[PDB]
Structure formats: C-alpha cells, structure tokens
Write a protein that binds this ligand. Structure first.
Ligand code: CLA
Ligand code: CLA
Ligand code: CLA
Ligand code: CLA
Ligand SMILES: CCCCCCCCCCCC(=O)OC\C(C#C[C@@]12O[C@]1(C)C[C@@H](O)CC2(C)C)=C/C=C/C(C)=C/C=C/C=C(C)/C=C/C=C(\C)C=C=C1C(C)(C)C[C@H](OC(C)=O)C[C@@]1(C)O
Ligand SMILES: CCCCCC(=O)OC\C(C=C=C1C(C)(C)C[C@H](OC(C)=O)C[C@@]1(C)O)=C/C=C/C(C)=C/C=C/C=C(C)/C=C/C=C(\C)C(=O)C[C@@]12O[C@]1(C)C[C@@H](O)CC2(C)C
Ligand SMILES: CCCCCC(=O)OC\C(C=C=C1C(C)(C)C[C@H](OC(C)=O)C[C@@]1(C)O)=C/C=C/C(C)=C/C=C/C=C(C)/C=C/C=C(\C)C(=O)C[C@@]12O[C@]1(C)C[C@@H](O)CC2(C)C
Ligand SMILES: CC(=O)O[C@H]1CC(C)(C)C(=C=C/C(C)=C/C=C/C(C)=C/C=C/C=C(C)/C=C/C=C(\C)C(=O)C[C@@]23O[C@]2(C)C[C@@H](O)CC3(C)C)[C@](C)(O)C1
Ligand SMILES: CC(=O)O[C@H]1CC(C)(C)C(=C=C/C(C)=C/C=C/C(C)=C/C=C/C=C(C)/C=C/C=C(\C)C(=O)C[C@@]23O[C@]2(C)C[C@@H](O)CC3(C)C)[C@](C)(O)C1
Ligand SMILES: CC(=O)O[C@H]1CC(C)(C)C(=C=C/C(C)=C/C=C/C(C)=C/C=C/C=C(C)/C=C/C=C(\C)C(=O)C[C@@]23O[C@]2(C)C[C@@H](O)CC3(C)C)[C@](C)(O)C1
Ligand code: KC2
Lengths: 193, 177, 171, 215, 228
C-alpha cells in the first residue's frame, strides 16, 4: 500500500518517515511494496547472518563430523570469512538447492505480494499444493505455533521489533565483513572476524 | 496450561520459573508434551540399559555378528566404549529401524498431535499383549502421571551418567569411570 | 504522459517504478535530465570509439612534453591532461551550460525554461523541423539514441575501470 | 523571539544585547529567525556546560587525582596538564566516550521523548538545554543526568531562572578560562597571570586518538 | 499512602532525624514499578540486610573467640583459632555450597507465592508486609516448627508491640551493618576504625568472592560412605 500506512515509522527518527532522499513519494505503490518485501528479506537474512557470524567467530563448532573425513571444527578453525569455502561442495550444493526451492515456491504462490499479497508475509507451507510434489506440513515460519497466542496488537508490535532488528542486523553484518576486510574500521571488532 | 503432568511436589500447580508458556498455543503445548514424553521414554530405556550393563547383568548369550570377530562380552562394561565397539552395520540397523518407526508414527496418526489428536500416543510399539486393555479411565491417568514422573527422573539419570562419563567426579555417587 | 515522446518502441510507456504516474507534473524535468544525459552519452560513446583509431597531431601542452598520440585511450588519457587543460575543459563546460545552453530556470532546483519544451536549448540558429511527423520521428530518434548511448557509455566506463581498454575481453 | 533576546540585560546590565557579527537573523539552512536564535542559544549553553566540565577536568588531570582501583591507570603519573593523559588513553575508550556523548545528545533531541515529557524541540518553541528524562525502550535506568538525586525537584521559578542566567554567564567565563589554559599549553600567549605553569602539549589539542583513522 | 507510611516509620525510628533520603531512591521507579512496590522492595532489602548483619556480627564474635560445635562436623577441619574471616576459609567447599544453597532455599520460600498465599499474605512489592517470612505451610512434606517463632512464644504480642519490635529491628540492623563493616574494613585497611586497631588481623583474600580460597575436599560422612 502507501508508505504512509506502513509499519516502518519508528520512534527513533522523530516518529515520522526517515526517508531523506524522497524515494517513497517519487515512486508508485508497487515499487514501495517491492521495497518493503526486499527490506524484510534483507533483514531476516541479515539477522541469520549476524548470529552465524558471531557463532563462527567465537569458534563454536558443532560436535561431530561435517563430511566423512571433515570435522566441523576443521572448517571452523579459521574465522567466518574463510569458512564457507572450506565447506564441501556437496553441502553448499544442498544448502543453495534448498534456498532455490524455497524462493521459487514462495514466489509462485497465490496473490503475489506485488499483485494483491502482503509484502513480507511468507506463506506458511510453500511446498503445499504443488502437483506431483509431497512435503510434510512443517510450517516455514513458526513450525511451532508461537504466534498463535499473540493478539493483533502484539503481532504489530513484534513486527515493528522485527523491522528494527533487521535494519540493525544489516548494519551489524556489514560491520563484521568490513571489519575483517578493512582492519581498524570498526573499533570493537578486534581480530577474529 | 492445565493438561497432565502436575501433581504433588509442586503444590498442584504448573512448574515454569522461566516462562516458556504464555507464548505457547495448543499446538505448541502439544509439541511440548510430545517432546517431553519421547525424551522421557528414551531416557527410561537409556537408564534401564546403562544401569543393567554397567553394574551387573548376565548379558546376552551368543556372539553378535558371526563374521566380524565381536562377542557380546567383548563389547565391555562401559557405556560409551561398548557403543563404539558395536559394528557399523548394527548401528545403522538400529538408527534405520528407529527412523522408519518415527516416520511411520508421524505419517500414521491422522489427527496429528500438532493438528488435534493426543500427544505421545504413537501407533504400535505399546502393549501387544494388552496388559492395559481393561484399565479404567481414572486409573490410566495415574499411570500416565507415573510415566511422566519416572521419565523426568530418568532424564536426570541419563544426563548424570553422561556427565560422569565426560567430566569425572561429577555426580558424586557415580565413580570415575 | 503515455502519449508523449519516447513511448514508441516495443515497450510502449515503460515506467515500472512509476515516477511519472506518481507525479505526472514532474515529467518535464525528467525529460530534460534524460535529454542532457543522452546528449552527453552520445558525445562520450563517439569519443570512446573515435579515439581508438583517430588521434590529433602534435603536442598537447608543449610544456609538460605530452603528445596527443601518447595518451592511451581512456581514463588514463584524462589523467595525463595538465591541470590547466582540465581547468579550461571545466570552464568550457560551465560556460556552455550555465549561460549558453541553459536547461533550467528557477533559483535552486530548476523547473524548465518558461513554456519551452524540455531540452529546448540553443535556439534561433538551430534546425527547427516542421512537418510534425518528421519532427516527432527526429525527436524520438534523439531520445532513443540517447538512451542507447547511456547504456553503452556506462558499459565502456565499467570496462575501462577494470581493464586498460573499453573493449570487453573476447572482442 | 528576537525581542526575547532582551534576557541579555538579565545576564549582564550595561552591556546588553551585544552582537557585532549580527547572527540574530542570518537564516540558518533556510529556517526561520526564531529557529536560528534557538540553535544559537542551545549551542551556547552546550558549549558553556562542556567548557565548565572541561575546566574542572583540566584541574583534576593537572593535579593527577586518579581512580583507586582502575586498571586503566597505566598512564604516566607525571603527565602533561591534560592532553597527553587524554592521548595516553586507549582509542576504544575515547571512542566509547564519544559514542556515549552522541547517544545522550540523540536522546536529548528526539522529538518523541521530548513531546512525551511535554516540551518541544529547542528550535520549535522549546527551552534550550532541557534534556528530558528516560522513557526508554526497555531499560529501567535509574538516575537521569539532571539532578539525579533530586536536589532541585522542588524549586521556585525565580530560582530556576537565576540559575539559568548563572549557568550561561559561568559557561561563557569557563569557555574563556579553558581556552586560556589550552593557549598557555600551546604557544603560551596568556603571559598575564601565566595561568599557573602548565607544561606544554606540543601536539594538537584538536587531535583525538593516537592514530589518524584516515578521517 | 506509600511515602506517608515511609515518613511515619522514619519518624518512629528517630523523632529527631525523621525522614532522611538524600539520594531520593524512594522516588525512583526501579523497574517502572510504581511507588508502592519500590518502597516495599527498599524496606524488604533494608530489613534483610539488617538481619543478616546482626547474625553476621554475632557469628563473627563466635568464630573470633572460638566456639566450635564438637566433633565429626565441618568444625573439625577448621584450625583452633584462625580469626573469623578464615573460618569461611577452611570448611570444605561442599559445605559452603550447601550453606549457600540452603540460604537460597530460604529466600525462595520467603518469595514463593504459594507459601505467602498459604498464610493469607501477598508479595511485599505487590502489597505485602516487608520482611515477613511465611511459615512453612505448603512444602509438600510437613515441617515441624516455623522459622520466625520456632517455639511460638510471640503469638500473644499486641500490634503496638510488633510495631515497636520492627522499629527496634531496623535501628539495630542499621547499627549492626555499621559495626560489621567496621570489622570488615579493619580487616582490610588499617587505621579506618580507630577503636578496632590491633584487635582484628589483616586478611589477604577477597571477602566478596565466596569460593575464593576454597576449602578442601574431604568426606566427613562415615557409615556407608560410598562417595569416597
Ligand atoms: C536494501 C535494504 C533496504 C530496503 C529495501 C529498505 C526499504 C525501505 N525502508 Mg529502510 N533501512 C535499511 C535498509 C533498507 N530499507 C537500513 C539498513 C536501515 C538502517 C539505517 C533502514 C532504516 C529505515 C528507516 C529508519 C525507515 C526506512 C524506511 C523504508 C521504506 C521507505 C523508504 C523508501 O522508499 O526507500 C526505498 C529504499 C530503497 C530503494 C533502497 C535503496 C538502497 C540504496 C541503493 C543503498 C544506499 C546505502 C548507502 C551505500 C549507505 C550505506 C551505509 C550504511 C551501511 C551505514 C522502504 C520500504 C522508512 C519506512 O519504513 O517508513 C514507512 C523509515 O522510516 N528504513
Ligand atoms: C546466513 C546464515 C548462515 C549461513 C550462511 C551459515 C553458514 C555456515 N554455518 Mg552457521 N549458523 C547460523 C547462520 C548461518 N550459518 C545461525 C543463525 C546459527 C545459530 C544457530 C549458526 C550456527 C552454526 C554452528 C553452531 C555451526 C555453523 C556452521 C556453519 C558452516 C557449515 C554449514 C553448516 O552446517 O551450517 C549449519 C547452520 C545452522 C544449523 C544454522 C541454522 C540455519 C537455519 C536457517 C535455522 C533453522 C531454525 C532452527 C532454530 C534450527 C533448529 C531446528 C530444530 C528442529 C532443532 C557454514 C559456513 C558450522 C561451522 O562452523 O562450520 C562447519 C557449525 O558448527 N553454524
Ligand atoms: C568533560 C570533560 C572531561 C573529559 C574529556 C575527561 C576525560 C578523561 N578523564 Mg576525567 N574528569 C572530568 C572531566 C573530563 N574528563 C571532571 C569534571 C572530573 C571531576 C569529577 C573528572 C575526574 C576524573 C578522574 C578522577 C579520572 C578521570 C580520568 C579521565 C580519563 C579516562 C576516562 C575516564 O575514566 O573518565 C572518568 C571521568 C568521569 C566519569 C567524569 C565525567 C563526568 C562528568 C563530566 C563530571 C562528573 C559529574 C558528577 C560530579 C559525577 C560524580 C562523580 C562521578 C565521576 C563518580 C579521560 C582522559 C581518569 C584518568 O586520569 O585516567 C588516566 C581518572 O582517574 N577524570
Ligand atoms: C543496604 C542497606 C540499606 C537499605 C536498603 C536502606 C533502605 C532505606 N533506608 Mg537506610 N540506613 C542504612 C542501610 C540501609 N537503608 C544504614 C546502614 C543506616 C545507618 C547509617 C541507615 C539510616 C537511615 C535513615 C536515618 C533513614 C533511612 C531510610 C531508608 C529508606 C529510604 C531511604 C532510601 O532511599 O534509602 C537509603 C539510601 C541508600 C540505601 C543508598 C544506597 C547506598 C549507596 C548506593 C552506596 C553508598 C556507599 C558509600 C560508600 C557510602 C558512603 C557513606 C558516607 C561517606 C556518606 C529505605 C527503605 C529512611 C527511613 O527511615 O525510611 C523508613 C531514613 O530516614 N536509612
Ligand atoms: C530449537 C528451536 C528453538 C525455537 C526456535 C526459536 C527461533 O528460531 O525464533 C527466532 C525468533 C523468534 C521468535 C518468536 O517466536 C518466538 C520464539 C516467540 C514468539 O512469541 C515471539 C517471536 C519473536 C515471534 C527471532 C529471531 C531473532 C533474531 C535471530 C534476531 C537477530 C538479530 C541480530 C542483530 C540485531 C544483529 C546485530 C549485530 C550487531 C549490532 C553488530 C554490531 C556491532 C557491535 C559490535 C555490537 C557494536 C559496534 O559498535 C562499536 C564499535 O562498539 C557496532 C556494530 C554494528 O559493529
Ligand atoms: C555545431 C555543433 C553541433 C553539435 C550537435 C551534433 O553534432 O549532432 C549531430 C547529430 C544530428 C544532428 C544535427 C543537429 C544536432 C540536429 C543540428 C546540427 O545543426 C545545428 C548546429 O543546428 C546538425 C545536424 C543536422 O547534424 C547527431 C549525432 C548523433 C550521435 C553522435 C549519436 C551517437 C550515438 C551513439 C550511440 C547510440 C552509442 C551506442 C553504444 C552502444 C549501443 C554500446 O553498447 C557500445 C558498445 O561498446 C559496448 C558497450 C561494447 C562493445 O563491445 C560494443 C559496442 C561498441 C556496441
Ligand atoms: C543423619 C542426619 C543428620 C545429618 C546432618 C549432616 O549430614 O550434616 C550436618 C553438619 C555436619 C555434620 C555431620 C554430623 C551431623 C556431625 C555427623 C554425621 O556423621 C556421619 C553420619 O557420618 C554427618 C556429618 C559429617 O555431615 C553440619 C550442619 C551444619 C549446618 C546446618 C549449618 C547451618 C548454617 C546456617 C547458616 C550459616 C545461616 C546462614 C544465614 C541465614 C540462612 C539467614 O540469615 C537467613 C535469613 O536471611 C534470610 C535468607 C531472609 C531473612 O528474612 C531471614 C533470615 C535473616 C533468617
Ligand atoms: C526507525 C527505525 O525503525 O529504524 C531503526 C533501525 C536502526 C538501524 C536500529 C537505527 C539505528 C541506529 C544505528 C545503529 C545506526 C548505525 C549507524 C552506523 C554504525 C553507521 C556506520 C557508518 C560507517 C560509515 C559511514 C563508514 C564510512 C567510511 C568512509 C566514509 C570512508 O571510506 C573513510 C574515508 O572516506 C573518508 C572519510 C575520507 C577519504 O579521503 C578516506 C577514506 C576513503 C578512508 C535507527 C535508525 O535509529 C532506528
Ligand atoms: C589576565 C586574566 O584575565 O586572567 C587570566 C588568568 C586566569 C584567572 C587563570 C584565567 C582563568 C581561568 C578561569 C577564570 C576559569 C574559570 C572557570 C569557571 C568559572 C568554571 C566554572 C565551572 C562551573 C561549574 C563546574 C558548575 C557546576 C554546577 C553545579 C555542580 C550545579 O549543579 C549547579 C546547581 O545549580 C544546580 C544545577 C541546581 C541548584 O539548585 C544547585 C547548584 C547551584 C549547585 C583567565 C581569566 O582565563 C585569564
Ligand atoms: C569508631 C568507634 O570507636 O566506634 C566503634 C563502636 C563499637 C560499638 C565498639 C563498634 C562496634 C560494633 C557494633 C556497632 C556492633 C553492633 C551490633 C549489633 C547492633 C548487633 C545486633 C544484634 C541483634 C540481634 C542478635 C537480634 C536478636 C533478636 C532476637 C533475640 C529476637 O528476635 C527475639 C525478640 O525480638 C522478638 C522476636 C520480639 C520481642 O519479644 C523481643 C525479643 C528480643 C525477645 C565499632 C565498629 O568498633 C565502632
Ligand atoms: C537472624 C534474623 C533476625 C534478627 C537478628 C531479628 C532481630 C529482631 C529484633 C531485635 C533487633 C526484634 C525486636 C525483632 C522483632 C521482630 N521480628 Mg525479627 N529478626 C530476625 C528474623 C525475623 C524474621 C524472619 C521475621 C521477623 C519478624 C519480626 C517481628 C514481627 C513483626 C510483625 O509480625 O508485625 C518482630 C516484632 C517477622 C516479621 O514479620 O517481620 C516483618 C518475620 O517474619 N524477624 N527482630
């Protein structure tokens, strides 16, 4: 919808729209819905990325063996920067194949988010209703119905928290990668990042 | 919420210092009870095995895999050391049978515990001889509560055994090995 | 604004983000911006292609001992220009745009000069096409060649910043 | 608000509204005149407060006075009157001090927390130098900055106004005194009174951190 | 009602001084938890600090003089005469652990809403009496005798006598906090308390670390000691 009736706002930037470049009023509603969907996907990816980068930088590896002959700690011996390349090729293939299937299934759903859907409301069962494909009814978001005890106002407040945390997580993961690439850029990030 | 599980030793009330409810629905509480019951039963089997093997027990007479050189008594008396001495075929057989059983448990109960149903009532593998085929509804709740309490105690038991094996002199009654 | 110039090709009126359907009164400024960008892009593409096989004779400064034939092809050619030559180029562009070819009236932002067309600079001594079909074809050709030149100039710039030449590898 | 600058009579008689460089109108960023003088008042009050605190800190650092159990007491015990013991601090601690000041000013100047307290921005019809309390995102946070124990919870408006005039006057005089100290540290110049023998920070007072950080 | 009760209790504690709050902690919302809960927490913590300080003063006297129980127990490892800071230095580590665990059990019982609502009481932040201890009457297995009045000879006390007892408790608690930290300060820095100079020896270990200078690991349990 319009950028005026949207859950971004936030109390940090005076309780109004932060946009200093005039992007929200220079484009149509379809572009704004695409921007909201892109921001939400970016925020969720960045939250996962920030937590994973912190875990890999603290050298917290899984107990066991990644591939037969390759230990989790063997891959995580260096920092998170030199970690994705140390994964075996088949594992990266399977991870990116699952991500490909998820993106195709979530984009091929009834009312697309630019054509009548809600931007950021990923369908609970992306692999349901596909002919010739059977998957269990594990939900993509909340396999455990945590947001079934929440009311509408609590859901809106936690959506606002999600947006703010996604923005902070984008800044944080870019901070981690830049602190490794350009030492001394971020003062807190010492060596092992 | 109300459910089963509560009784004495807590005051007839629900035990959760850290909240872990009020963010849970009927589906989430059903998952909580299903995970609790599966962990409970696995832990009861685990203590009944480790306690029998490590302490005493005549052990199974026979050979265990006529071709590879292994004996039932050659596995040992330690828990983790004898598990590694089990052959890879035996380990894969155990894990495959367990996986087949649970996949069929997920696909066999049509009111799913996350979509209705009763949590912890898995098909098959319970009384084949029907020992509890005549029990009253009031008595069955007592047995379910006893199962839950014994299962929680057994969870603590298996983690005591694991702690004593990994970090020595923890769980002071358990010895250094 | 769907019937204006530039909406002629296979796409018709192509506004995905909807800049001119959100603000239909802002089309004239966008058209002037596009026309200046296109003209600079045509000049830049022509310079890129012609400097490869054509070079001026003689020196460039006769004081830094720099020749026209010694500037390689591209960004480094603009590097080797003396600071006085750069100052004169910037002075030429500034005098050409602030006073002679003036695309903007208005104090700060610049709307459109009076009731002229967007990009209707120069004036008087310039060819004014009558026969409105011919004028429409000429203007649409100017706009489309400008857009193609924008994409081409961007591509050759992308090539020049990661190579020594604007020619892509394999060509 | 231009005639609301008649408070300079209360700051000091005889020398009333004294603005040779006539910044009273001088529209800043295209804003109105009252917003410009509100910015001027807030900047003056902030500069005075920081100058007073820096004066006291200068005296402290010149007379050593270190914390008892601080393990960042590895700085040299002699120490220049002040800028070297600032320079001897590790860079992360200076960055944390600067980020603290920035966070606290961003808290001071948010319009959500200002209007919830009941008082607008200082260029939108508000008192300069207010600093509202803590209605923070989930953070109890005892003790705001201003009178945290409550020394002036009850006070007449005349006493508060007199304290505001005293704050502005002492802030101006502390700006003068602190830069007299920094001048006597670098290319002395304040040979009247000599300021009481401050060694000499050969370096730049305006050079934070040991490293240049390429900015 | 909150600050008025606070003024009245301060006036009864000392008519001359009265309400003395220079820090103004009685106006700070500690967790955004109104005024009633904040003053209830403050009074409960003051009362707990005073009771623990009175008990600590008596125990410090007992250990500094040398007042051991007898045989077999944890007193058998403590040397005969080591000053009171060093008697929490020679008892076994598990003795310290179990002591702190029992104190935590007592605190949890004093805070558990089942115990408070058993004998008709609410939480001190939620509107209960600060410093009150619920008896025992919810603890699954029955308890023989209570903790406040073990032999129940204070059940005939008038409410005025109870109020005067609370005022005396608070005053004695404050003065015992001052005395006990006189002892602890003289055990760390000499010349702080002039009266206690030369009586209390200096101690090197940290007082605020419980298991610092941890005790030995000995099994004092005989008969069936399968935990060797
Ligand atoms: C690429 C990620 C991304 C995307 C798609 C969006 C999209 C949006 N944001 Mg947003 N935001 C982001 C990242 C992003 N944000 C980050 C990281 C922050 C934290 C600083 C914020 C903070 C923020 C606030 C505080 C607000 C928004 C709002 C909005 C919405 C309206 C603004 C608009 O139309 O801009 C469209 C945006 C784009 C088309 C993206 C342009 C991206 C450019 C090319 C990148 C430039 C970055 C530059 C290199 C500097 C980076 C440095 C940085 C890492 C420190 C829109 C849905 C407003 C809102 O929701 O109101 C309803 C609002 O108030 N955002
Ligand atoms: C952007 C997201 C992202 C990416 C690309 C990676 C990438 C990587 N992680 Mg990693 N990780 C992430 C997020 C991410 N992580 C998060 C959020 C956590 C915290 C839980 C971790 C915790 C983690 C550990 C502990 C380890 C890795 C390891 C690795 C490396 C090997 C691949 C692997 O086994 O991953 C496994 C990654 C996960 C299991 C993260 C879960 C990601 C999904 C989307 C979330 C699922 C939700 C749910 C809570 C999971 C529990 C299910 C439940 C039934 C129990 C690889 C470089 C290993 C390593 O160091 O190299 C060998 C390793 O030992 N990760
Ligand atoms: C406003 C300017 C200013 C600046 C930039 C500094 C900078 C510095 N001070 Mg400093 N200081 C200042 C004012 C300032 N001070 C004032 C006004 C006082 C008197 C209270 C002190 C007293 C002081 C001591 C006693 C010590 C420092 C130290 C230091 C250094 C380490 C950082 C630190 O721990 O600070 C700590 C400083 C503060 C927390 C004071 C700032 C807070 C405000 C501005 C003043 C106090 C308000 C109020 C009265 C608070 C009650 C007291 C409270 C500090 C407990 C650093 C170079 C340490 C040092 O030399 O290390 C090498 C050290 O031991 N300062
Ligand atoms: C931790 C112990 C403790 C606690 C929780 C309280 C709590 C309280 N006291 Mg109290 N008091 C104590 C010890 C304590 N007292 C001691 C030891 C004395 C004797 C000196 C007094 C003497 C006293 C009087 C005379 C009065 C109170 C009163 C009160 C009540 C309101 C005042 C207030 O906000 O708190 C009091 C303030 C604090 C507890 C501040 C916290 C301590 C700070 C943060 C640390 C300071 C440490 C530092 C080294 C001290 C330096 C001492 C010296 C140099 C000045 C409140 C319930 C009032 C009352 O009767 O209401 C019923 C009152 O009029 N107190
Ligand atoms: C087993 C299964 C258990 C159940 C599953 C639970 C589950 O998966 O739920 C996951 C889940 C959930 C859920 C709920 O449903 C639950 C469970 C219950 C329900 O009622 C409610 C909800 C909520 C719906 C949420 C997830 C949230 C996440 C991951 C947010 C992640 C957010 C990362 C950030 C901000 C990164 C920040 C990085 C920063 C700041 C980096 C940095 C820095 C510093 C170093 C800090 C400092 C530096 O500055 C200097 C120089 O000092 C600046 C900077 C930028 O460099
Ligand atoms: C007196 C000064 C006059 C200045 C004006 C002027 O001179 O205009 C002259 C003019 C018409 C005109 C006139 C008027 C202007 C109407 C009026 C004039 O009369 C007067 C004075 O009134 C005379 C007249 C009739 O002539 C028209 C000029 C038009 C011009 C100069 C048009 C350039 C297109 C370039 C393109 C499309 C590049 C695409 C580039 C593309 C598509 C690429 O991708 C590049 C590529 O590299 C990539 C990236 C990778 C490589 O592997 C492959 C290639 C190489 C493909
Ligand atoms: C067989 C049955 C008996 C077994 C007993 C046992 O096994 O051990 C017993 C034992 C030693 C022993 C043994 C023998 C008994 C000697 C003989 C046996 O020999 C064999 C069989 O082999 C075993 C052995 C070696 O163990 C020693 C026991 C020592 C003990 C029981 C030491 C309590 C300290 C209390 C303190 C420090 C108070 C702190 C202070 C507290 C708790 C407070 O201030 C609480 C409070 O502030 C709170 C939190 C809030 C306020 O509102 C209220 C107040 C102010 C009140
Ligand atoms: C309302 C709402 O919901 O939003 C929420 C979301 C969110 C995120 C939590 C919010 C926030 C607050 C936060 C945490 C914001 C974080 C901001 C952060 C952390 C921003 C780092 C910048 C680092 C930079 C720019 C590095 C530059 C680096 C530059 C420019 C250089 O290259 C340096 C250099 O170039 C110079 C300078 C000169 C050249 O000669 C030399 C070189 C090339 C070397 C909000 C907005 O408050 C509320
Ligand atoms: C030749 C010549 O001219 O001399 C030479 C040499 C010489 C003399 C050395 C020089 C100098 C240096 C000078 C004069 C430096 C002066 C420095 C100066 C004047 C520094 C002010 C600090 C103020 C503070 C810290 C305020 C604290 C304020 C506090 C702590 C408050 O809370 C205020 C309070 O109000 C509240 C908020 C509420 C009220 O209910 C209670 C009170 C009232 C307590 C010169 C002039 O530069 C040059
Ligand atoms: C610098 C200088 O020179 O100063 C010196 C002075 C001095 C004095 C030498 C020094 C000291 C040490 C000090 C200050 C020590 C203070 C010690 C203190 C104040 C210790 C309280 C104990 C309270 C108890 C045990 C409570 C019992 C409580 C009991 C028995 C009951 O509850 C029962 C009862 O209540 C009911 C339930 C209700 C009523 O029916 C009444 C009774 C009683 C039956 C210093 C530190 O060196 C400093
Ligand atoms: C070692 C710990 C300790 C010490 C050293 C100590 C000292 C004194 C002194 C001497 C200075 C007096 C005079 C005194 C008197 C009273 N005490 Mg204390 N007392 C201690 C422990 C407890 C506990 C656990 C409770 C308690 C209480 C009461 C009540 C009842 C008030 C009422 O019922 O209104 C009165 C009159 C109960 C209560 O409810 O306090 C709110 C309660 O639970 N006391 N108490």
């Amino acid at each position: 919808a319009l950028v005026d009736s949207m859950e971004g706002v936030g109390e940090e930037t005076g309780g109004q729209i932060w946009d200093p470049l005039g992007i929200s009023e220079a484009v149509s509603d379809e572009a704004v819905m695409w921007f909201r969907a892109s921001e939400l996907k970016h925020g969720r990816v960045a939250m996962l990325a920030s937590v994973g980068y912190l875990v890999g930088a603290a050298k917290i590896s899984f107990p066991g063996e990644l591939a037969k002959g390759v230990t989790f700690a063997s891959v995580a011996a260096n920092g998170p920067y030199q970690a994705w390349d140390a994964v075996p090729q088949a594992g990266k293939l399977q991870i990116l194949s699952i991500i490909l299937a998820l993106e195709w299934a979530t984009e091929a759903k009834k009312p697309h988010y630019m054509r009548g859907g809600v931007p950021g409301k990923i369908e609970q069962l992306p692999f349901d209703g596909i002919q010739g494909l059977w998957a269990p009814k594990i939900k993509f978001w909340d396999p455990l119905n945590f947001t079934g005890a929440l009311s509408a106002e609590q859901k809106a407040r936690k959506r606002k928290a999600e947006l703010k945390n996604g923005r902070l997580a984008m800044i944080g993961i870019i901070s981690f990668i830049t602190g490794h690439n350009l030492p001394g850029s971020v003062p807190a990030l010492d060596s092992s990042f | 919420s109300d459910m089963e599980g509560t009784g004495p030793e807590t005051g007839g009330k629900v035990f959760d210092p850290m909240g872990l409810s009020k963010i849970a629905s009927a589906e989430t509480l059903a998952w909580y009870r299903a995970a609790e019951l599966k962990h409970s039963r696995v832990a009861m089997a685990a203590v009944t095995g480790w306690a029998w093997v490590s302490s005493g027990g005549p052990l199974f007479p026979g050979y265990l895999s006529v071709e590879q050189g292994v004996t039932f008594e050659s596995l040992g008396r330690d828990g983790y050391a004898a598990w590694a001495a089990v052959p890879e075929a035996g380990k894969f057989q155990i894990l495959g049978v367990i996986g087949i059983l649970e996949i069929l448990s997920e696909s066999a109960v049509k009111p799913h515990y996350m979509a209705g149903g009763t949590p912890g009532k898995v098909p098959l593998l319970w009384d084949p001889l029907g020992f509890t085929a005549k029990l009253s509804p009031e008595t069955l709740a007592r047995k379910r509560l006893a199962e839950l309490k014994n299962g929680r105690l057994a969870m603590i038991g298996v983690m005591s055994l694991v702690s004593a094996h990994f970090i020595p002199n923890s769980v002071p009654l358990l010895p250094g090995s | 604004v769907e019937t204006e110039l530039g909406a002629t090709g296979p796409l018709g009126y192509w506004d995905p983000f909807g800049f001119s359907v959100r603000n239909p009164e802002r089309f004239n400024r966008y058209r002037a911006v596009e026309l200046k960008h296109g003209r600079i892009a045509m000049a830049a593409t022509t310079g890129y292609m012609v400097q490869s096989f054509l070079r001026w004779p003689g020196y460039l400064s006769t004081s830094a001992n720099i020749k026209f034939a010694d500037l390689p092809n591209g960004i480094a050619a603009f590097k080797a220009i003396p600071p006085a030559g750069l100052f004169q180029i910037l002075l030429f562009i500034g005098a050409m745009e602030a006073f002679t070819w003036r695309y903007y009236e208005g104090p700060w932002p610049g709307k459109v000069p009076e009731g002229k067309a967007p990009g209707d600079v120069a004036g008087d001594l310039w060819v004014r096409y009558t026969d409105p079909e011919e004028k429409a074809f000429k203007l649409n050709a100017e706009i489309n060649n400008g857009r193609a030149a924008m994409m081409g100039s961007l591509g050759m710039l992308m090539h020049d910043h990661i190579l020594g030449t604007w020619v892509p590898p394999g060509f | 608000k231009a005639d609301l600058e008649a408070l300079a009579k209360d700051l000091n008689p005889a020398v009333g509204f004294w603005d040779p460089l006539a910044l009273s109108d001088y529209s800043f960023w295209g804003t109105s005149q009252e917003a410009t003088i509100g910015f001027l008042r807030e900047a003056e009050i902030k500069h005075g407060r920081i100058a007073m605190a820096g004066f006291v800190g200068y005296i402290v650092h010149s007379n050593d006075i270190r914390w008892t159990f601080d393990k960042v007491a590895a700085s040299v015990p002699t120490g220049l009157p002040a800028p070297a013991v600032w320079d001897a601090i590790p860079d992360i601690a200076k960055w944390q001090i600067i980020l603290f000041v920035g966070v606290m000013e961003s808290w001071r100047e948010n319009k959500v927390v200002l209007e919830a307290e009941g008082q607008k921005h200082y260029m939108s019809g508000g008192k300069p130098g207010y600093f509202p309390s803590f209605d923070l995102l989930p953070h109890p946070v005892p003790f705001p900055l201003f009178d945290p124990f409550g020394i002036s919870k009850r006070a007449t408006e005349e006493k508060k106004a007199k304290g505001r005039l005293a704050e502005i006057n002492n802030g101006r005089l502390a700006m003068i005194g602190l830069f007299g100290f920094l001048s006597e540290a670098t290319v002395p110049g304040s040979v009247p009174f000599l300021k009481g023998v401050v060694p000499a920070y050969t370096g730049e007072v305006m050079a934070p951190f040991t490293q240049n950080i390429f900015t | 009602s909150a600050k008025a009760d606070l003024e009245a209790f301060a006036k009864e504690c000392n008519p001359v001084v009265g309400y003395w709050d220079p820090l103004g902690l009685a106006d700070l919302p500690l967790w955004g938890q109104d005024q009633d809960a904040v003053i209830g927490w403050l009074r409960h913590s003051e009362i707990k600090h005073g009771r623990i300080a009175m008990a600590g003063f008596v125990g410090y006297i007992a250990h500094a003089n040398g007042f051991r129980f007898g045989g077999i127990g944890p007193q058998n490892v403590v040397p005969e005469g080591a000053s009171a800071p060093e008697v929490w230095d020679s008892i076994p580590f598990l003795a310290k652990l179990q002591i702190i665990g029992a104190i935590g059990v007592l605190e949890h019982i004093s805070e558990d809403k089942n115990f408070l609502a058993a004998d008709g009481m609410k939480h001190y932040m939620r509107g209960g009496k600060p410093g009150y201890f619920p008896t025992f009457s919810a603890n699954v297995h029955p308890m023989p005798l209570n903790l406040f009045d073990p032999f129940k000879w204070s059940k005939n006390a008038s409410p005025e006598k109870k109020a005067k007892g609370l005022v005396t408790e608070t005053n004695n608690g404050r003065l015992a906090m001052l005395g006990l930290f006189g002892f602890l300060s003289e055990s760390k820095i000499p010349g702080s308390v002039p009266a206690l100079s030369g009586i209390i020896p200096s101690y090197d270990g940290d007082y605020m670390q419980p298991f610092l200078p941890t005790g030995p690991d000995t099994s004092l349990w005989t008969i069936g000691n399968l935990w060797a």
